[PDB]
Design a protein around this ligand. Structure first.
Ligand SMILES: C[S@@+](CC[C@H](N)C(=O)[O-])C[C@H]1O[C@@H](n2cnc3c(N)ncnc32)[C@H](O)[C@@H]1O
Ligand code: SF4
Ligand SMILES: [Mg+2]
Ligand SMILES: [Mg+2]
Ligand SMILES: [Mg+2]
Ligand SMILES: [Mg+2]
Lengths: 164, 398, 126
RNA sequence: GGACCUGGCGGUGCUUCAUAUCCCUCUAGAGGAGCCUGUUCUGUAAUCGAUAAACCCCGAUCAACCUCACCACCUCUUGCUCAGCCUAUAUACCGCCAUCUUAACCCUGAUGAAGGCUACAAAGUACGUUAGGUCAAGGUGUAGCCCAUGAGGUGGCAAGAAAUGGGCUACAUUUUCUACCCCAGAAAAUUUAGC
């Protein structure tokens, strides 16, 4: 797959219409080797439904796409990155579903098909979650998803979904 | 010798001679006078509104002549041989003389403005002719990715847009000069620091990406390799560009001995594959202008160049149309399409009463000075040569 | 050696440039042709051309400097400055030959006034 | 590993002024009409192509039935004369134009890297290059075709449309004609300079 080039920091600064490098208020992992490492540690994703959060520039997104994922659902809150994610989607037809929304409220139990929903006592249900979010958002999210596991609802309606 | 009088005849495929006149024969690759897109000319004039007085005319003339008459940097070994000869016949002073002092051009803001004003239209014309070659001969080609090494002002980007804008989606422009990159951005934004780009998908980089994994449909280098300080630098750059070439590698230089020598070195480098196990195993051939992959028959003493006429950007000094004399080589991945390859006219065709002088680079690797006449060569072939021009192809077989 | 490592005597007439012809230099030829009202400037010019080529071909490697061609009435004086490298007998033979030949070619009493010098009189080095 | 020295940023900005080149501001003229050229598009089998080679001689001119060039047909040729052709080449040289390239001594620091100023004075003093143009006020060679790049004949060919680039003419009332040479009578947007 011929994916478009990864944005540089100058291109990111222009994209946020910020015109400077000091007021980013955000840190980007623009090194594809570390993102490749992270996706490797996420497990074998060949033909796996991956729900990715906090894409931003899209290093994790490109790394996941390079793995033979079946469908990749992406949720982005900043609309300014949606153009880049859209070009990335055009590069990979039918393997990227972008959604503009907030991960603390987005409802994943309806995103993927119902044929995926495996029992709790069987193996994890081929659905993986990967995320590099702001640290101010990852802890409410993990608390919320722990509550979901305790209730066996939300992303864990499919079974014992693994998170990275 | 690709014209044996009484034996060679015109090549009639697709029912040529019956279904279309002689002026439109398939080797006609002449491009009408090139006029720049109005946005580019407007942007250039707006960017030069600050200072375009009598001093600028002198600066442009000086820079153009300096670039035209610049020689390749002399390699160590040639200096060593010359030093030995002079010693056999103080030596250092005699070497300061009779040797070209090659210097790096540091393109600051002022010199970038001068270079833009001096070379934008000429480079656009040359690159447009080189691209028209591919468009005319393979009209089914729809590139999606283009890289341009030494993207000075974006003339390559603008020409590629003007030709393949309905398919191109990524224009990678590499240039170590921050001033040149800023100027290219301004020109793309209509000559204003704030605006919307005229061409979408243009990426600007200060360093050349070195990786065989990423591969572009068209890789271009126009008047760029002559800026590199040494043959080793030229070699490594050409190797990288070929590795990242997907379909076509287009090298364009001045129409001088230096430019032609540079391009022939690059052609030999690409044609003689050294890499043991490259990621892309496809072989390379010369799409244009050479009808063969044999050594240039004309590199011994002369050069080889082609002319494209164009209308310069309006200025206080640009009144009449100009000619851009350039050397080109296009290297394509794969193998030649067929075996019916045609000679290339590498020199102005001289029309004289009942005969035509044409200098041809034949598929066998030799130059032929042919004086075509009706009685000797056939009426149809004579008419084809009569209507042909410099840089075209002559459709002859056996 | 390496690229960063790297990076003629003239007489008075040769040294001075053409814009000194009436300021520092003079005129090698002196005749009345170019004065206001006089005639035959072209014929005198062609005569001077032939004299100079003839003399430079008849005294090869002997002439130190340019000739001076003076003209009084129908006389024609060639004042040349030659070197002392050729033998004096050959100098006399050539003087007689050239004088007779030029007198019969221009139908006027030509004359030659050789001046030998030990070597080229260098003025400066350019 | 410790100490020290030179660096390198032909970098980046900010402060004040000398701040001349370069800028603007300012001043005076230059768009219409009729012809001729440059580029594009369309069209022809083809050239609305040129006159040391036509015609018009008030100036200039178009296509002229001059002639050459082009397109479609033909004919000759051992012929002009051991014939004939600006056919090529300065991408053969030479000429002419143009392009570019072209120290020593003495002191200080422990005679380390290294450094050397104070005026009411404290070590400082002495040619080549070019596939360049030009074959019109100039030359020396080299090659081409020689049943045709030579010589003739019979017909044609004579283009069309714009937007813009340029040039020439007449364009007035502060004018025009006569007498005079100045007190009369009748008629009716960029651009170019600035000094
Ligand atoms: C002068 S431009 C030539 C014209 C330009 N290619 C165009 O099409 O308009 C060549 C540029 O190449 C850049 N360059 C030279 N060496 C380079 C290198 N080693 N890596 C990247 N860019 C380089 C210089 O900055 C220079 O401006
Ligand atoms: S002379 Fe022939 S072989 Fe040589 S560069 Fe030109 S086209 Fe290619
Ligand atoms: Mg003739
Ligand atoms: Mg001629
Ligand atoms: Mg030449
Ligand atoms: Mg006609």
């Amino acid at each position: 797959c011929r994916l478009p080039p990864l944005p540089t920091i100058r291109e990111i600064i222009k994209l946020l219409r910020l015109q400077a490098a000091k007021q980013l208020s955000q840190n980007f992992l623009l090194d594809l080797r570390l993102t490749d490492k992270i996706v490797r540690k996420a497990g074998n994703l060949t033909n796996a439904y991956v729900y990715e959060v906090g894409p931003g520039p899209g290093g994790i997104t490109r790394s996941i796409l390079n793995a033979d994922v079946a469908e990749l659902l992406v949720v982005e809150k900043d609309t300014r990155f949606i153009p880049g994610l859209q070009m990335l989607s055009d590069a990979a037809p039918g393997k990227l579903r972008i959604v503009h929304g907030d991960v603390l409220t987005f409802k994943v139990e309806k995103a993927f098909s119902e044929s995926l929903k495996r029992p709790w006592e069987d193996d994890p249900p081929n659905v993986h979650i990967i995320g590099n979010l702001p640290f101010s958002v990852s802890t409410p999210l993990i608390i919320k998803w722990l509550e979901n596991i305790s209730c066996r609802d939300g992303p864990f309606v499919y079974g014992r979904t693994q998170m990275t | 010798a690709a014209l044996v009088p009484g034996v060679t005849q015109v090549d009639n495929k697709s029912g040529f001679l019956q279904k279309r006149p002689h002026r439109q024969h398939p080797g006609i690759l002449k491009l009408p006078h090139v006029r720049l897109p109005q946005a580019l000319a407007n942007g250039a004039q707006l960017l030069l509104l600050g200072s375009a007085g009598p001093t600028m005319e002198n600066q442009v003339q000086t820079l153009t002549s300096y670039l035209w008459s610049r020689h390749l940097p002399v390699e160590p070994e040639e200096l060593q041989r010359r030093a030995r000869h002079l010693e056999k016949k103080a030596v250092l002073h005699a070497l300061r003389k009779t040797t070209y002092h090659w210097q790096e051009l540091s393109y600051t803001e002022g010199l970038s403005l001068v270079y833009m004003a001096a070379r934008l239209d000429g480079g656009f014309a040359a690159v447009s002719r080189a691209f028209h070659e591919i468009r005319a001969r393979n009209p089914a080609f729809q590139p999606q990715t283009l890289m341009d090494f030494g993207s000075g002002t974006g003339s390559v980007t603008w020409a590629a847009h003007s030709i393949w804008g309905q398919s191109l989606r990524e224009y990678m422009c590499v240039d170590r000069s921050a001033a040149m990159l800023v100027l290219a951005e301004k020109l793309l934004k209509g000559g204003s620091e704030s605006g919307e780009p005229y061409i979408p998908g243009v990426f600007f980089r200060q360093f050349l990406p070195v990786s065989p994994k990423v591969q572009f449909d068209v890789v271009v280098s126009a008047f760029s390799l002559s800026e590199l300080p040494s043959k080793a630098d030229r070699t490594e750059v050409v190797q990288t560009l070929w590795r990242k070439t997907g379909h076509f590698l287009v090298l364009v230089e001045n129409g001088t001995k230096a430019g032609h020598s540079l391009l022939m070195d690059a052609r030999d480098l690409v044609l003689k594959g050294k890499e043991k196990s490259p990621l892309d195993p496809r072989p390379g051939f010369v799409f244009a202008p050479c009808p063969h992959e044999l050594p240039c028959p004309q590199l011994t003493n002369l050069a080889c160049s082609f002319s494209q006429a164009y209308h310069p950007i309006p200025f206080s000094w640009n009144k009449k149309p100009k000619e851009e004399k350039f050397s080109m080589v296009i290297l394509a991945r794969g193998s030649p399409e067929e075996a019916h390859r045609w000679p290339r006219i590498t020199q102005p065709v001289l029309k004289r009463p009942r005969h035509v002088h044409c200098h041809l680079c034949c598929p066998d690797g030799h130059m032929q000075h042919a004086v075509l006449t009706a009685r000797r060569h056939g009426r149809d072939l004579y008419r084809c040569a009569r209507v042909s021009s410099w840089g075209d192809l002559l459709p002859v077989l056996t | 050696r390496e690229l960063p490592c790297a990076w003629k005597p003239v007489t008075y007439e040769e040294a001075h440039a053409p814009h000194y012809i009436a300021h520092r230099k003079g005129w090698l030829s002196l005749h009345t042709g170019n004065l206001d009202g006089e005639d035959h400037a072209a014929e005198r010019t062609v005569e001077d051309v032939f004299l100079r080529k003839f003399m430079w071909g008849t005294f090869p490697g002997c002439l130190a400097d340019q000739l001076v061609l003076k003209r009084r009435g129908n006389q024609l004086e060639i004042c040349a400055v030659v070197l002392r490298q050729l033998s004096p007998h050959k100098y006399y033979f050539l003087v007689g030959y050239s004088e007779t030949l030029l007198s019969y070619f221009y139908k006027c009493p030509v004359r030659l006034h050789l001046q030998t010098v030990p070597s080229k009189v260098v003025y400066k080095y350019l």
